[PDB]
Ligand binder design. Structure first.
Ligand SMILES: CCCCCCCCCCCCCCCCCC(=O)OC[C@H](CO[C@@H]1O[C@H](CO[C@H]2O[C@H](CO)[C@H](O)[C@H](O)[C@H]2O)[C@H](O)[C@H](O)[C@H]1O)OC(=O)CCCCCCCCCCCCCCCCC
Ligand code: CLA
Ligand code: CLA
Ligand code: CLA
Ligand code: CLA
Ligand code: CLA
Ligand code: CLA
Ligand code: CLA
Ligand SMILES: CC1=C(C#C/C(C)=C/C=C/C(C)=C/C=C/C=C(C)/C=C/C=C(C)/C=C/[C@@]23O[C@]2(C)C[C@@H](O)CC3(C)C)C(C)(C)C[C@H](O)C1
Ligand SMILES: CC1=C(/C=C/C(C)=C/C=C/C(C)=C/C=C/C=C(C)/C=C/C=C(C)/C=C/C2=C(C)CCCC2(C)C)C(C)(C)CCC1
Ligand SMILES: CC1=C(C/C=C(\C)CCC[C@H](C)CCC[C@H](C)CCCC(C)C)C(=O)c2ccccc2C1=O
Lengths: 86, 49, 79, 130, 665
């Protein structure tokens, strides 16, 4: 699976969460920024690696980073449809 | 009439045909008489012949 | 030969062929014996490379390990 | 001398054949003896099949053959509709004579850049309308 | 109707049409997007009425452009051409309405065409077209040019007017029944009848006089006079080597009558199976659906034109004008391919913007079987060539697929003309000759089928998987032209219908290049050439009939067609006639190679290089406020594709035209 990390530069605009195609991310309460919320990545097992969160991130450099891990590819991260590894 | 049979003539293709026009035994006469003696700027009607 | 080279045809270059093969069956057999020894050693080496180092050996293997005095001197000298 | 004795003596730079001319003479003798100009491939594979007038030899289209392709295998193509050419020449000559008589004067070559008055124009001719 | 709203104020805004370009010129990507979306009237600011306005007015403006081009052609023929010399003696003088300057030694390009004329030999067949039309005077050509210019002005005025005449209530463009009926009865039926009238009344007497040899002004200013009872096409004009123009006029009269009859039966509702097409009628009332259908129709008609303009001779002396016939075939084949890939593109756009038809719901079997047929066709067809190569190299011709060896006879390729035995000749040239099909024709035709099927596979996959797929389920949300969906799910590169076209264009170009090479080599080897003397002639062909013996191997194609026949273009530098063709050969090679830059590289390298370069500009205080950017991914693909196709087409163009020009002169 890929690694989706969030950094404190986050401003809690929720655009990453809204752009998530498989609902990997969710906003959580925080005090670091004025919006009082920061995106989290609890369901990183479903991350496919499309980097749409990264596309939608406003900050100067991304407060959300998706690191691709081709060696640890799973069926959920590969979006397998015709074949099942479960 | 296309591949096994080599039809050389229009008569072969369509029975009873021998030329560009259909084989009608009617000679189409002129609907109106023509001037025996012409005049400058006449442009007599063309003939399909 | 049916040469296809312009220079070969022009200069009459030839590929001379011997009347008898250079090596005999016994010589080829000896070379193949050496090659077989190489192959056995190479299979052993490939197995060793595949399995890598075994740090568990100190638990069961015979002996108490040994470092050559020159290796000890190198270690003391350092890098 | 001759290739047989040249090859019998043989060439060896180390001992006697220190002469490049002798070396290449022996090489030429060996070449003539052991090399062939061509592999000897059958000439048939080089001959054309289509467009050379020898198509019928191969029997490629035997079932319901195409009439337009000549049956002769000599490699020559007859001219299609030969009989019409004399007829066409006669028709065109007859039409030429007919139009010559109809006009009443010799045909005059048209000018690409020239200007001609219309035969029915009401004004006096400037350039002959023909 | 209100023309007070057309002002030049918007001319300097440069991006008003697209709302996404409101933040003008923050980067060079803005310039590129402006150009890319200039003519995408659907996504532009306004309404559906405005979209229709723009579509119709742009069609009229392009009509005016084409009329201007035709008028320029007529003017060049009239004033900058040797049409007079060609008309009096077509064989001796090559057509040339093209003259070059003497700027830098550039006068070398002009070549001997006549005693008093030097220029560039044209290959469009315009001289033959004029001769068929009966145009034999500079005055006639000048008035044709004047008519074309007047039509250009009229079309320009019509576009400008219709930009405001049509309002939001305008609906005449949605009256498909009226549109089709009018086009079928008037534009096609009445048009064909009127052109038959024109032929009968103007071209037939002039052409008959020209065939006879009469050049008298009074004569230039009795149908079926010379045509025998022989079937049309079975007997060519002995003095011109083309179908009788009276037969052509009768054809046009019959075609116009048939079109009028079809329109009238449709008007009377005689056609009954409306329900079988009602689904398409409801679904495909869209701009892009109609554009795709029309593009495919015109592509197929262009291919049929390419085949017929050569196989069936109708223009005077075009049969013996070998460069003309070759160039016409190649040009129309290329247009066929381009318009077919265009039809695929706009089918994909229609699927994206509108609801698709129900054949998309079993798309997996369709594309799966197409994939299988493509694989099997390619394997067999190309592996026969590879087998021939390998076996011939090994020295076993008896094991290869050829007429002498194992032979693959095209049993289904059967005659239908029923022509008489022999060939038709005209002044030392073979105007018409039957093409004899064998193993080489079988193999090349199956190669053609393979390439066509692979191009169709790419286009159909793009069309059917445009809305969604197993990989990505929101491709509809992504749109039509996007680079990817991300590196995820393994990587979603080129999943868009735009990229499917970007690949189908490569495959169409490959198919058309093979088709061009097949036509060129087959015609040179087995059809074209001269003859040496009931009489029997031995026909000396330009390529010496080597297609049937050498085309069976890829090495034969490489040697006897590319290398052997590139002697003219490769050795064209000293020759005044074709030095330009040699230089264009070289430059097209350069451009094709230069395209690989964009086809292989990626955006990020160039963006980083641009930033490193911009460091120095900033250091020296050269600050471009339209910040430089690397070309987008889709733009890089488009640029690479354009340069690739242009370079390949230019190489083929120069090679074939140089060969033909040298051989015929
Ligand atoms: C052939 C192709 C033909 C296409 C079909 C033509 C359709 C016929 C149009 C009917 C006449 C028309 O509606 O007639 C009117 C038309 C259209 O006018 C429209 O007229 C309308 C009239 O409106 C009025 O209309 C009503 C009038 O009662 C009410 O008053 C209403 O409230 C009010 O709006 C509006 O004004 C529109 O804005 C206006 O466009 O008039 C125009 O403007 C006339 C436009 C003619 C353009 C001709 C261009 C030709 C240029 C050739 C140049 C060659 C020169 C040689 C140069 C040589 C040198 C090299
Ligand atoms: C729209 C197409 C079109 C046009 C503009 C013309 C124009 C002309 N034709 Mg016609 N003609 C046409 C189609 C057309 N033709 C076709 C398709 C054919 C082939 C069958 C002919 C065959 C033909 C002949 C054989 C003759 C004409 C003639 C004429 C003249 C007027 C005929 C007339 O009004 O008769 C009106 C008659 C009725 C309404 C009945 C004029 C030059 C005559 C001419 O110019 O003679 C010198 C003439 O003799 N035409
Ligand atoms: C399809 C359209 C088309 C094309 C491709 C050409 C192409 C050409 N024309 Mg042109 N021409 C056209 C339409 C066209 N013409 C039309 C419609 C007419 C009038 C009906 C003419 C009238 C015409 C004449 C009278 C001459 C040409 C000439 C030429 C050649 C040189 C042009 C030149 O020096 O430009 C120079 C560059 C420019 C004008 C710059 C254009 C851009 C700036 C902003 C203006 C060139 C091959 C010349 C030629 O062949 O000489 C041997 C020549 O003498 N043309
Ligand atoms: C200044 C350059 C120039 C100009 C202005 C023209 C103008 C014209 N040529 Mg062309 N021509 C040129 C150079 C030029 N030519 C050269 C260098 C040659 C080689 C000798 C020719 C050979 C030639 C022939 C043989 C003919 C013409 C014709 C024409 C007319 C066609 C209308 C037209 O272009 O539509 C616009 C068309 C296009 C934009 C075509 C685009 C796609 C082409 C076909 C792709 C082919 C490859 C391409 C040429 C090179 C790619 C590589 C390159 C980037 C390095 C027009 C008068 C025809 C005619 O009827 O003339 C009266 C004609 O028969 N020309
Ligand atoms: C593809 C060609 C085409 C088509 C389909 C149409 C279609 C139309 N034009 Mg025409 N038009 C054209 C070319 C074309 N035009 C050109 C080239 C010009 C420039 C001369 C014009 C100039 C023009 C004007 C000035 C007007 C039309 C009008 C019309 C309408 C037809 C009514 C009419 O008078 O019919 C009979 C023919 C319709 C929107 C009229 C309209 O919309 O009235 C409401 C109108 O006023 N057109
Ligand atoms: C009276 C006869 C007549 C004639 C000669 C034409 C001619 C034309 N119409 Mg049509 N049209 C007519 C009646 C007619 N129309 C009528 C009565 C209507 C209903 C109002 C229309 C409505 C109409 C529309 C809505 C459109 C046309 C278009 C066209 C052009 C399409 C050509 C094309 O795409 O070729 C294709 C050829 C190749 C690809 C090669 C052409 C100039 C189209 C166009 O672009 O017009 C500018 C177009 O969009 N016409
Ligand atoms: C007056 C009748 C007539 C005449 C004289 C012609 C003449 C012609 N047609 Mg035809 N044609 C006609 C009616 C006619 N057509 C009709 C009613 C249609 C239906 C709309 C067509 C559709 C048509 C098409 C689609 C094509 C032709 C073509 C041709 C040309 C070559 C045909 C050939 O060699 O056939 C050979 C003759 C035979 C095989 C004998 C069979 C004759 C019948 C079936 C019996 C020639 C100019 C071709 C063309 O223009 O090529 C450049 C072409 O592609 N025609
Ligand atoms: C794989 C697909 C394919 C394609 C795209 C083409 C394309 C072409 N073939 Mg055909 N051809 C095919 C297969 C194909 N062929 C096969 C398998 C054979 C048998 C070896 C032939 C034998 C053949 C000959 C002898 C000739 C052509 C020719 C042609 C041309 C069309 C005109 C014609 O006569 O077609 C005829 C098409 C056929 C005879 C094939 C029929 C369609 C398929 C095979 C039906 C199979 C369906 C079946 C019910 C179920 C199969 C189930 C599966 C699990 C096994 C064109 C280049 C002609 C040509 O122009 O040659 C120069 C020609 O002379 N083909
Ligand atoms: C077992 C046993 C006992 C015993 C015993 C006894 C007496 C055993 C005797 C064994 C004996 C007498 C064994 C000979 C072998 C000969 C060989 C392998 C020769 C190979 C030769 C080779 C491989 C040569 C090959 C070639 O080079 C050649 C020649 C030519 C070259 O062109 C190349 C080649 C490669 C082709 C004890 C001591 C009595 C009691 C104990 O308790 C148990
Ligand atoms: C350019 C070009 C081309 C070509 C084109 C063409 C050539 C087309 C056609 C065109 C045409 C050729 C058209 C036609 C038209 C015609 C018409 C449209 C007509 C109409 C008619 C009418 C309208 C009638 C009227 C009338 C009269 C006469 C009077 C009274 C009666 C009536 C009303 C009936 C192509 C495609 C290749 C593309 C490229 C280039
Ligand atoms: C080279 C390259 C670039 C860099 C190329 C750029 C930025 C193009 C430069 C544009 C110039 C400024 C346009 C002006 C036109 C030329 C300078 C004209 C030259 C004409 C000669 C005859 C002199 C990309 O950005 C790129 C992006 C994605 C895939 C591949 C590539 C790619 O291959």
């Amino acid at each position: 699976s890929h690694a989706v990390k969030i950094y404190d530069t986050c401003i809690g605009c929720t655009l990453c969460v809204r752009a998530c195609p498989t609902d990997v991310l969710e906003m959580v309460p925080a005090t670091v920024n004025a919006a009082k919320q920061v995106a989290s990545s609890p369901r990183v097992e479903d991350c496919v690696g499309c980097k749409r969160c990264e596309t939608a991130c406003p900050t100067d450099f991304l407060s959300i980073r998706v690191y691709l891990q081709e060696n640890e590819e799973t069926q959920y991260s590969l979006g397998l449809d015709l074949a099942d590894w479960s | 009439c296309f591949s096994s049979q080599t039809c050389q003539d229009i008569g072969d293709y369509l029975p009873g045909w021998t030329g560009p026009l259909p084989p009608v035994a009617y000679d189409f006469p002129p609907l109106y008489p023509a001037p025996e003696v012409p005049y400058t700027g006449y442009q007599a009607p063309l003939k399909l012949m | 030969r049916v040469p296809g080279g312009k220079r070969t045809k022009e200069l009459g270059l030839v590929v001379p062929i011997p009347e008898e093969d250079g090596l005999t069956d016994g010589q080829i057999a000896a070379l193949f014996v050496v090659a077989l020894v190489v192959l056995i050693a190479a299979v052993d080496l490939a197995r060793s490379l595949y399995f890598g180092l075994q740090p568990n050996k100190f638990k069961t293997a015979k002996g108490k390990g040994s470092i050559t005095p020159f290796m000890k001197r190198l270690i003391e000298n350092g890098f | 001398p001759s290739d047989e004795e040249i090859l019998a003596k043989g060439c060896d730079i180390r001992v006697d054949c220190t002469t490049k001319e002798q070396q290449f003479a022996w090489a030429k003798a060996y070449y003539r003896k052991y090399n062939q100009e061509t592999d000897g491939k059958d000439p048939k594979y080089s001959k054309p099949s289509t467009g050379a007038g020898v198509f019928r030899k191969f029997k490629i289209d035997w079932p319901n053959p195409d009439p337009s392709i000549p049956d002769t295998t000599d490699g020559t193509y007859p001219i299609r509709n030969e009989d019409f050419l004399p007829i066409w020449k006669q028709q065109q000559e007859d039409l030429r004579a007919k139009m010559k008589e109809y006009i009443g004067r010799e045909f005059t070559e048209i000018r690409w850049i020239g200007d001609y008055d219309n035969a029915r124009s009401p004004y006096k001719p400037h350039n002959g309308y023909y | 109707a209100i023309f007070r709203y057309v002002n030049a104020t918007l001319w300097s805004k440069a991006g008003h049409f697209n709302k996404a370009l409101s933040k003008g010129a923050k980067t060079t990507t803005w310039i590129w997007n402006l150009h890319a979306s200039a003519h995408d009237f659907d996504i532009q600011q306004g309404s559906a009425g405005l979209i229709a306005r723009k579509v119709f007015s742009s069609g009229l403006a392009h009509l005016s452009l084409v009329f201007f081009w035709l008028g320029g052609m007529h003017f060049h023929g009239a004033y900058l051409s040797n049409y007079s010399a060609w008309l009096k003696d077509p064989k001796s003088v090559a057509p040339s309405s093209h003259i070059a300057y003497s700027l830098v030694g550039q006068d070398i390009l002009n070549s001997y065409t006549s005693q008093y004329f030097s220029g560039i030999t044209i290959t469009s067949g315009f001289f033959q077209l004029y001769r068929s039309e009966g145009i034999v005077t500079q005055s006639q050509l000048k008035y044709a040019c004047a008519a074309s210019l007047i039509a250009t002005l009229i079309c320009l005025s019509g576009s400008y007017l219709h930009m405001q005449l049509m309002s939001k209530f305008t609906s005449f463009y949605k009256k498909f029944q009226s549109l089709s009926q009018s086009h079928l009865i008037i534009m096609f039926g009445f048009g064909s009848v009127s052109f038959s009238a024109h032929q009968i009344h103007e071209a037939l007497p002039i052409n008959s006089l020209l065939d006879s040899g009469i050049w008298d002004p009074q004569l230039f200013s009795a149908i079926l006079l010379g045509t025998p009872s022989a079937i049309t096409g079975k007997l060519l004009n002995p003095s011109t080597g083309s179908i009788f123009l009276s037969q052509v006029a009768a054809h046009h009269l019959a075609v116009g009558i048939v079109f009028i009859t079809l329109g009238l039966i449709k008007w009377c509702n005689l056609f009954f199976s409306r329900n079988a097409i009602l689904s398409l009628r409801l679904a495909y009332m869209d701009y892009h659906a109609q554009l795709s259908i029309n593009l495919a129709v015109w592509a197929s008609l262009s291919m049929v034109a390419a085949h017929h303009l050569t196989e069936i001779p109708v223009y005077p002396y075009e049969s013996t004008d070998y460069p003309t016939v070759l160039c016409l075939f190649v040009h129309h084949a290329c247009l066929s391919g381009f318009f077919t890939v265009a039809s695929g593109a706009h089918a994909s756009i229609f699927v994206i913007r509108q609801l698709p038809t129900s054949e998309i719901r079993h798309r997996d079997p369709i594309i799966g079987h197409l994939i299988w047929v493509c694989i099997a066709l390619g394997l067999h067809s190309f592996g026969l060539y590879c087998h021939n190569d390998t076996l011939e190299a090994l020295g076993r011709p008896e094991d290869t697929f050829c007429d002498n060896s194992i032979q693959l006879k095209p049993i289904f390729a059967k005659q239908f003309l029923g022509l008489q035995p022999g060939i038709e000749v005209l002044d030392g040239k073979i105007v018409r000759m039957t093409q004899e099909l064998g193993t080489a024709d079988f193999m090349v035709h199956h190669i053609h089928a393979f390439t066509i099927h692979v191009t169709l596979l790419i286009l159909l996959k793009g069309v059917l998987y445009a809305r969604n797929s197993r990989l990505v389920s929101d491709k509809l949300e992504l749109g039509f032209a996007y680079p990817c969906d991300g590196p995820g799910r393994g990587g979603t590169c080129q999943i868009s219908p735009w990229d499917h076209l970007f690949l189908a264009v490569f495959w169409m170009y490959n198919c058309l290049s093979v088709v061009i090479f097949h036509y060129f080599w087959k015609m040179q080897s087995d059809v074209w050439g001269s003859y040496v003397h009931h009489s029997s002639l031995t026909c000396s062909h330009y390529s010496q009939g080597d297609f049937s013996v050498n085309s069976i191997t890829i090495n034969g194609w490489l040697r006897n067609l590319l290398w052997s026949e590139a002697s003219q273009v490769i050795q064209s530098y000293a020759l005044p006639s074709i030095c330009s063709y040699g230089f264009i050969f070289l430059a097209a090679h350069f451009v094709w190679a230069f395209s690989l830059m964009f086809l292989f590289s990626g955006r990020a390298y160039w963006q980083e290089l641009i930033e490193s370069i911009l460091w120095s500009h900033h250091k020296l205080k050269i600050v471009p406020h339209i910040q430089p950017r690397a070309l987008s991914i889709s733009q890089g693909r488009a640029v690479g594709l354009t340069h690739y196709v242009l370079g390949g087409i230019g190489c083929t163009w120069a090679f074939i035209i140089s060969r033909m020009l040298v051989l015929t002169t």
